[PDB]
Amino acid sequence: IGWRREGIKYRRNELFLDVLESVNLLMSPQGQVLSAHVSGRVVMKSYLSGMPECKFGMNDKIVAIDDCTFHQCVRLSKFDSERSISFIPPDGEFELMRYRTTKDIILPFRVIPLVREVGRTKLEVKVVIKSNFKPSLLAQKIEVRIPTPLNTSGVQVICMKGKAKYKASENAIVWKIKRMAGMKESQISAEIELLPTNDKKKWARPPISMNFEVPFAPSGLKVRYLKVFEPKLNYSDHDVIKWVRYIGRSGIYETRC
Amino acid sequence: DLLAWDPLFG
CATH class of the missing domain: 2.60.40.1170 (Mu homology domain, subdomain B)
Structure with a gap:
């Protein structure tokens, strides 16, 4: 052998x-x-x-x-x-x-998005995540990537767990959670200020992506x-x-x- | 981290 x-x-x-x-x-x-x-x-x-x-x-x-x-x-x-x-x-x-x-x-996580158009210059983006596994176990290195329109000027964002930041160079909100037990949920809410654009087409929304272990x-x-x-x-x-x-x-x- | 290793008994 x-x-x-x-x-x-x-x-x-x-x-x-x-x-x-x-x-x-x-x-x-x-x-x-x-x-x-x-x-x-x-x-x-x-x-x-x-x-x-x-x-x-x-x-x-x-x-x-x-x-x-x-x-x-x-x-x-x-x-x-x-x-x-x-x-x-x-x-x-x-x-x-x-x-x-x-x-x-x-599917260890369920992502539940909500996008609301407040007039012509404002977008509200909200995401709930739900951990779908035993409560005795922990997910770690959690990252939720939320796309933003190209005509984004300003972002305000808060989250119920972890930390979030708007990265203008990536047209994304990045939400990081160090650890989350099974059968839990959290939420992020963003308000996005939109500038005038010659883009006639409505925002083709990329999907929300996750990392986790x-x-x-x-x-x-x-x-x-x-x-x-x-x-x-x-x-x-x-x-x-x-x-x-x-x-x-x-x-x-x-x-x- | 070593805590992620479980014993296989038998």
């Missing part, structure tokens, strides 16, 4: 499984999903003595997922042949699997087990120290306004 040399020895048999997902959304102004996908990977970092045979089990068929591809080390499992895979891994860090889902995605896979995928068998060194599962981390991030996470 080409990807792992013989004679590897470690004082401490240990492995790390990193479940990393990007959640993508195009939502209507009224809250209809126009498109959504998760792109995901499992990265394994292992320091295991010898030539261990490993079996990776998940909560769902991997052998509600698509475009699923595996490292060259990956083989069919004997038992749980639909929810697990079996392999002798490369030493150190490698990508075990890469996948796409479209079905049953957790969440400590769960938006696909719903969960690691159930990583079993290890080293036939020659005769260590097994209880001998190996095993960790899992889930990081869900926004990809292109857009809501039309």
